[PDB]
Design an enzyme around this catalytic site. Structure first.
Site, PDB file in Angstrom:
ATOM      1  N   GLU A   1       0.841  -1.192   0.000  1.00  0.00           N
ATOM      2  CA  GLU A   1       0.000   0.000   0.000  1.00  0.00           C
ATOM      3  C   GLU A   1       0.885   1.255   0.000  1.00  0.00           C
ATOM      4  O   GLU A   1       0.750   2.111  -0.871  1.00  0.00           O
ATOM      5  CB  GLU A   1      -0.937  -0.001   1.220  1.00  0.00           C
ATOM      6  CG  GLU A   1      -2.079  -1.029   1.183  1.00  0.00           C
ATOM      7  CD  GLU A   1      -1.617  -2.484   1.242  1.00  0.00           C
ATOM      8  OE1 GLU A   1      -0.695  -2.799   2.018  1.00  0.00           O
ATOM      9  OE2 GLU A   1      -2.195  -3.320   0.517  1.00  0.00           O
TER      10      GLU A   1
ATOM     11  N   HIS B   1     -12.655  -6.960   6.424  1.00  0.00           N
ATOM     12  CA  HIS B   1     -13.328  -6.991   5.135  1.00  0.00           C
ATOM     13  C   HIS B   1     -14.505  -6.036   5.003  1.00  0.00           C
ATOM     14  O   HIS B   1     -15.197  -6.039   3.976  1.00  0.00           O
ATOM     15  CB  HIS B   1     -13.801  -8.406   4.838  1.00  0.00           C
ATOM     16  CG  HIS B   1     -12.846  -9.197   4.008  1.00  0.00           C
ATOM     17  ND1 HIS B   1     -13.113  -9.532   2.690  1.00  0.00           N
ATOM     18  CD2 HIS B   1     -11.624  -9.710   4.296  1.00  0.00           C
ATOM     19  CE1 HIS B   1     -12.102 -10.220   2.195  1.00  0.00           C
ATOM     20  NE2 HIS B   1     -11.191 -10.335   3.158  1.00  0.00           N
TER      21      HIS B   1
HETATM   22  C1  LIG Z   1      -2.378  -5.421   3.744  1.00  0.00           C
HETATM   23  C2  LIG Z   1      -3.255  -6.192   2.801  1.00  0.00           C
HETATM   24  N1  LIG Z   1      -3.378  -5.826   1.466  1.00  0.00           N
HETATM   25  C3  LIG Z   1      -4.200  -6.568   0.652  1.00  0.00           C
HETATM   26  C4  LIG Z   1      -4.907  -7.651   1.077  1.00  0.00           C
HETATM   27  C5  LIG Z   1      -5.804  -8.451   0.139  1.00  0.00           C
HETATM   28  N2  LIG Z   1      -5.167  -9.822  -0.146  1.00  0.00           N
HETATM   29  C6  LIG Z   1      -5.578 -10.872   0.551  1.00  0.00           C
HETATM   30  S1  LIG Z   1      -4.824 -12.313   0.194  1.00  0.00           S
HETATM   31  C7  LIG Z   1      -3.857 -11.527  -0.986  1.00  0.00           C
HETATM   32  C8  LIG Z   1      -2.864 -12.333  -1.739  1.00  0.00           C
HETATM   33  C9  LIG Z   1      -1.539 -12.509  -1.032  1.00  0.00           C
HETATM   34  O1  LIG Z   1      -0.811 -13.559  -1.579  1.00  0.00           O
HETATM   35  P1  LIG Z   1       0.419 -14.435  -1.097  1.00  0.00           P
HETATM   36  O2  LIG Z   1       1.111 -13.646  -0.048  1.00  0.00           O
HETATM   37  O3  LIG Z   1       1.184 -14.930  -2.229  1.00  0.00           O
HETATM   38  O4  LIG Z   1      -0.327 -15.584  -0.368  1.00  0.00           O
HETATM   39  P2  LIG Z   1      -1.297 -16.766  -0.861  1.00  0.00           P
HETATM   40  O5  LIG Z   1      -2.595 -16.159  -1.123  1.00  0.00           O
HETATM   41  O6  LIG Z   1      -0.647 -17.176  -2.165  1.00  0.00           O
HETATM   42  O7  LIG Z   1      -1.092 -17.910   0.141  1.00  0.00           O
HETATM   43  C10 LIG Z   1      -4.165 -10.174  -1.054  1.00  0.00           C
HETATM   44  C11 LIG Z   1      -3.502  -9.216  -1.974  1.00  0.00           C
HETATM   45  C12 LIG Z   1      -4.743  -7.992   2.469  1.00  0.00           C
HETATM   46  N3  LIG Z   1      -5.354  -9.019   3.053  1.00  0.00           N
HETATM   47  N4  LIG Z   1      -3.911  -7.237   3.291  1.00  0.00           N
HETATM   48  C1  LIG Z   2      -9.909 -10.995   3.006  1.00  0.00           C
HETATM   49  C2  LIG Z   2      -9.630 -12.131   3.991  1.00  0.00           C
HETATM   50  C3  LIG Z   2      -8.478 -13.111   3.758  1.00  0.00           C
HETATM   51  C4  LIG Z   2      -7.149 -12.371   3.749  1.00  0.00           C
HETATM   52  C5  LIG Z   2      -8.708 -13.858   2.453  1.00  0.00           C
HETATM   53  C6  LIG Z   2      -8.927 -10.552   1.939  1.00  0.00           C
HETATM   54  O1  LIG Z   2      -8.361  -9.453   2.099  1.00  0.00           O
HETATM   55  O2  LIG Z   2      -8.755 -11.298   0.955  1.00  0.00           O
END
Ligand SMILES: Cc1ncc(C[n+]2csc(CCOP(=O)(O)OP(=O)(O)O)c2C)c(N)n1
Ligand SMILES: *C(CC(C)C)C(=O)O
Ligand SMILES: Cc1ncc(C[n+]2csc(CCOP(=O)(O)OP(=O)(O)O)c2C)c(N)n1
Ligand SMILES: *C(CC(C)C)C(=O)O
Ligand SMILES: [Mg+2]
Ligand SMILES: [Mg+2]
Lengths: 338, 407, 338, 407
Positions: free
Chosen positions: A61, A130
């Site tokens: 962010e 959320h």
């Molecule tokens: C600070 C923040 N920004 C955005 C999100 C939305 N978000 C949730 S899961 C995700 C994907 C992250 O992926 P990765 O770290 O590769 O983990 P995976 O889903 O592959 O296990 C995102 C962008 C969040 N939860 N927190």
């Molecule tokens: C919501 C909840 C969990 C991290 C899937 C999101 O930000 O995707």
């Protein structure tokens, strides 16, 4: 001409219009590119304008807002996204310490004509991260401009207007209203936008002036100050209480339309503030503090506010938290009491 | 004139829907090729390891190299049980998600070996700081399926009393720290937990987790920094499943680099391991647990795996990557590979595989039925509304009391 | 026994007492260790208790709060510092998204018995990032406890009390009052603490209950709601206006002492809110909103608030920004008017 | 029993007041020993360079190695002028700080070569994102001393109209981006500025700055991440002067590591250069400017120097480090070393040194006098109070108008 769109489709149109109208307009954020956004709000934008205009960004962010600030310094007009308003915190410093004070501390040499879109609001079993409403974290920031639409038409106009404004704009988008209006009734399955007022959106360029509120339901009984999903909750709640309450959708949280508000309470003599955000020090506290200043004598009762409880947003107890037509309606009576 | 126009570079995956991903970008190594350093190795001497791959099980299912040493078959059987249990529970819950009995769910298809493997190499008292995809740890630590499911349903029996989203578990008794929707934050907190243990002259260690996508989050860097500065007893795990929702790991900064190499740059001994090679996961985890517990400092481990299924029940992989992708992944299926190796060495059989599979299915169906008896999304049977104002503070401050009565 | 100390010396004593009273107490932050802090607030603490108890930390706010959260999860009681309140932003996410909701989202399994000390306040030619008052960014956070002292005695008690509380505490420390009281008069050179009331501080353990405000100047004319440096500004301003205004130093911003406040305005019939922070959505907006709710009828005039302008803190125009005895006093009259 | 109690590790400097710092921790290299790679070198091939030292001028003041090539004496003379001008202005302003004519000031004693050197290797249109210690850049770009001083006094002539703290300059005309008190934030913003230039098919580049201490700040990591992912035309400068107020660089994560090595780990070509060797600073900067402008990607440069004076006018080095420290620093004084080399090659003389010194002193005294004619801290002569509500937004919103009239 004109086409019928949902909020998602409206916002998408705004960016499509601007991306086409100003060579300096750029769009980027997490999953905003190829995929088109986790909410489809940027679909096909990259395919039509290219990687250099619309693209995917790393999960950062602060990095998203920070580079955008530097981009604006160069001379670009960045429209950036934050998947969920719940996740803006990492960008707090860049937002408050930089973006807001850029024009001031530089005496106009450098400016931040940026726009940050953040889906907000609850009523969808989102949970703690959320579905919060952080508007109060922004409006108290000298230098920012906070905006929140309530329908397709307004969604496009206020975005196109927010984008062109030369001041940093925090554009809040109620995810609850993305597919269709929501009054707060989970029993009655919700309907789309094509079967409701204000889904008629112009295909080309047009705007909806900032700093200008809007009366949703003309009334003489009580003034209802709100925005977002609670707009449709105030309308229905008014119809249930029978109360001829005047529903005011600020549209612009801050700066706000102080006149259209002080004018409706001046006539009425009483107002009730309604927003999802927690209570204590929420945005509703400023609205109350201004009403009490420019409408002290013409006030015929204590100013009331129906908001979310001072607790993190639960999942199971969803409907017990969200200020629905019921808890709100009750307020429309408590104020009309002698 | 002299200088050509600068251009923006936006990394793209080799394979998009209707194409085939060229998995060459993975800096893979053959089984046994990577050496096994002493647990006291210096961070800098781990440079080469950070850009290679620690792998035991080869194409034929045979164990190769130094990492194959001292590996008890009983631990692998518990491993298989853990992986099977995780995948079966995962399948079952997606179904329950569709039949609207549940609000939301996330699978760990293809990654079941990583969390289960490390859990088994640590002590129950070693606290883990997981993301939302390490349910395999809970399974390896035999946590009640009934309590897990209740939380996924927000029943009156939900241990979190409905206050949290489904899969945002919290099991302190099983060294499983309360999950948060905010990415990366737990990574730095795990370092603090380790610092706390060192401050108290304890012998417990921390096990932090984070995905490739979240590594770009500020707290990733903060974690490495504090881990190094204070020589914290923490294992910093990075699960590189190649994706973060719809974004290919290259956009996370993975192009021409590795995530393990970032540990080397911050003074941390690092390891890049085959995440779908259980033996390799147990061995590398044991290695790091030992380095930490001996006070030799933190460790950073990049687990090279692949996110086999959707990001969640709200995602659609078909819109951004090949649907046949997992089929071509050079490192395959963790459960299939351990099965092949286990059988070849005489400690597993097609018979045990099926039988064990059948029992976890029964166990899951029974647990689901047991949990549903306390509510669902349909059944308004959920936690009270007054429990909603509890625990915000140790003692319900006046303002909340008011809000409670006002309900 | 007892000794005469400045706020700096008082706070230092509190940490010295706790570091000695609870083996689980830890102190760390930027320059807090060997050096003893950029304000001397932690002098000799490391020499006396060791590196493992008091130590220097990397320049990372989020890292400082984050590791502290994990520390509390283990079972420690972290007292951590942030050189200037202006620099808390990088730790926003860890503060709001983690520290505050730790107890709630875990149903009590894990807790955050942390204390974050942050020097705040202006009136020292600090500038934009050297003298802001972010209290309003915290009080709107469900799960936090915001505290701010106004004198040596209270400074120690509220710290020792804030430390022992099992809830995350944001301990704001007015740098302006570090060396001595300040009424807002820059012409009259300021005096130390040894020549003023409340500089007598006990050497050992003692506390000052949270959630409990305090009347500084008993009055019947107007209720003055304030905290920090504006406490001494309200006292003097009252003496200049002559107004027999009752000065209330909340001490605990939130949760706050709702009774001692509603009780002073109930008698009086009028109140004025005074704080350095910018106006819009400042903490003063919540105070106003509560007063208007529990004291609507007993109110004999519009509730007024004297605060900082809605602009970033300037350097040159210091005295034109800071709400001094003058601009405040003027308010004490505007309210006493018919 | 089996495991000994874990212990917390807190790095400490070798020298504290009343001792002598053992500068061995610096991974120094002799002049000319480090090679000069092609500007298209791959990030990974810069690993060895990230843990060495690029240095031209030796103990005798002679230029050694590949980095000595193509170096115009006229650029060095402008350099010397820039370094002398910065140090003399610095001294003068501390005095004015003591005589209370000024509110606050920060010196760059011992670091004058870094910013002046890079400024001269870039174009004026190349935007710099400096911290509070790169005033040497303004001097190299001949910015009005009168306007700088006015801002340090908050006069009616302050270009920032008193809205900012002293030394928090802003000079867009000289490619000097508005300074902020918040550390590290400008590092990431500089990457955005570069991304903007690439997006527009421009040829301008960004010059970002940050100190060793601030590298632990989240935006440092964010900067490297975005720089790498988008191949941004930015020079990422890290000024390692060994300290951040009272904290030794080891607590920033410098123990057994280098700051340049962090660029290598994030896929960025990195360089560790002698920051008190002007020739080396001009050469390495030119090298990085060229790599970027040619679209070959960002560069990370760690400048090894030493903060000779107090952190600021509010600091006291005697309370945490040896007072005789700078005297033993292996890399010495930038102005003294260039003076020795310049003279030995026939392009400077003791005569020019003194004469040039005398003119900057006059220039500074005259400028100070010229600036004071517009106000001081004593003279209430400062910017209006109504200008205080301007520029918060492009157009003064109603609420501010109200607040203005209410004054
Ligand atoms: C600070 C923040 N920004 C955005 C999100 C939305 N978000 C949730 S899961 C995700 C994907 C992250 O992926 P990765 O770290 O590769 O983990 P995976 O889903 O592959 O296990 C995102 C962008 C969040 N939860 N927190
Ligand atoms: C919501 C909840 C969990 C991290 C899937 C999101 O930000 O995707
Ligand atoms: C975000 C933030 N935290 C803390 C501070 C207080 N602070 C100001 S300067 C400084 C030292 C930073 O040192 P370094 O980066 O090494 O730069 P130098 O002072 O040596 O040039 C600190 C901690 C700040 N300005 N911003
Ligand atoms: C204040 C201003 C500048 C960074 C010296 C500080 O935080 O030190
Ligand atoms: Mg991933
Ligand atoms: Mg430094």
């Amino acid at each position: 001409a004109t086409t019928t769109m949902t909020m998602i489709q409206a916002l998408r149109s705004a960016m499509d219009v601007m991306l086409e109208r100003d060579d300096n307009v750029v769009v980027y954020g997490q999953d905003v590119g190829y995929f088109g956004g986790v909410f489809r709000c940027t679909e096909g934008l990259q395919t039509k304008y290219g990687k250099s205009r619309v693209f995917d960004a790393p999960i950062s962010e602060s990095g998203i807002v920070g580079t955008a600030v530097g981009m604006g310094a160069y001379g670009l007009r960045p429209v950036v996204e934050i998947q969920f308003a719940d996740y803006f915190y990492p960008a707090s410093d860049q937002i408050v310490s930089e973006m807001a004070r850029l024009r001031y501390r530089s005496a106009g040499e450098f400016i931040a004509p940026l726009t940050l879109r953040m889906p907000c609001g609850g009523g969808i079993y989102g949970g703690q991260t959320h579905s919060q409403s952080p508007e109060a974290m922004f409006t108290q920031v000298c230098g920012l401009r906070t905006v929140m639409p309530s329908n397709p038409y307004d969604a496009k106009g206020l975005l196109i207007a927010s984008i062109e404004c030369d001041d940093p704009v925090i554009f809040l988008e109620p995810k609850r209203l993305y597919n269709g209006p929501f009054d707060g009734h989970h029993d009655r399955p919700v309907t789309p936008w094509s079967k409701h007022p204000h889904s008629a959106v112009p295909d080309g360029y047009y705007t909806v002036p900032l700093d200008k509120a809007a009366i949703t339901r003309p009334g003489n009984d009580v003034s209802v100050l709100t925005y977002g999903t609670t707009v449709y909750v105030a309308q229905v709640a008014a119809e249930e209480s029978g109360v001829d309450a005047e529903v005011i959708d600020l549209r612009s949280l801050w700066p706000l339309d102080l006149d259209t508000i002080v004018e409706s309470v001046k006539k009425t003599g009483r107002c009730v503030v309604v927003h999802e955000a927690t209570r204590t020090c929420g945005f509703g506290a400023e609205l109350v503090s201004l009403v009490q200043e420019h409408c002290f004598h013409h006030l015929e009762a204590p100013i009331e506010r129906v908001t979310g409880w001072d607790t993190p947003y639960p999942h199971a107890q969803e409907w017990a938290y969200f200020p629905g037509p019921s808890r709100v309606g009750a307020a429309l009576k408590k104020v009309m009491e002698v | 004139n002299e200088y050509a126009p600068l251009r923006l570079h936006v990394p793209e995956p080799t394979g998009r829907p209707g194409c085939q991903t060229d998995f060459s970008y993975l800096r893979l190594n053959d089984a046994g090729q990577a050496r096994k350093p002493p647990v006291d190795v210096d961070a800098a001497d781990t440079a080469d390891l950070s850009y290679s791959l620690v792998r035991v099980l080869d194409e034929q299912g045979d164990a190769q190299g130094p990492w194959a040493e001292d590996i008890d078959p009983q631990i692998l059987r518990q491993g298989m049980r853990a992986m099977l249990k995780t995948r079966i529970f995962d399948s079952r819950m997606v179904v329950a998600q569709r039949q609207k009995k549940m609000s939301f769910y996330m699978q760990s298809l293809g990654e079941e070996a990583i969390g289960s493997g490390q859990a088994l190499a640590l002590n129950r008292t070693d606290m883990c700081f997981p993301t939302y995809r390490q349910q395999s740890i809970l399974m390896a630590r035999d946590v009640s399926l009934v309590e897990m499911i209740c939380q996924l349903l927000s029943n009156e029996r939900d241990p979190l009393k409905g206050r949290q989203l489904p899969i945002m578990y919290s099991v302190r008794e099983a060294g499983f720290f309360t999950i948060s929707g905010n990415l990366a934050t737990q990574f730095v907190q795990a370092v603090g937990w380790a610092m706390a243990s060192a401050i108290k002259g304890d012998t417990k260690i921390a096990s932090a987790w984070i995905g490739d996508g979240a590594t770009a989050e500020s707290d990733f860097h903060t974690a490495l920094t504090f881990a190094h500065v204070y020589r914290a007893p923490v294992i910093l795990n990075v699960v590189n499943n190649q994706w973060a929702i719809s974004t290919f790991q290259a956009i996370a900064g993975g192009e021409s680099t590795t995530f393990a190499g970032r540990g080397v740059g911050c003074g941390i001994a690092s390891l890049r391991v085959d995440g779908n090679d259980f033996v390799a996961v147990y061995a590398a985890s044991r290695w790091a647990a030992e380095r930490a517990r001996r006070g030799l400092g933190p460790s950073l481990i990049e687990w090279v795996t692949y996110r086999a299924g959707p990001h969640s029940t709200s995602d659609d992989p078909s819109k951004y990557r090949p649907a046949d992708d997992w089929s071509h992944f050079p490192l395959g299926d963790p459960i299939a590979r351990l099965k092949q190796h286990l059988i070849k060495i005489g400690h597993w059989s097609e018979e045990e595989h099926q039988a064990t599979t059948a029992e976890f299915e029964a166990a899951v169906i029974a647990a689901q039925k047991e949990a549903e008896q306390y509510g669902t999304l349909a059944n308004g049977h959920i936690p009270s509304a007054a429990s909603m104002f509890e625990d915000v503070y140790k003692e319900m401050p006046d303002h909340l009391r008011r809000q409670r009565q006002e309900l």
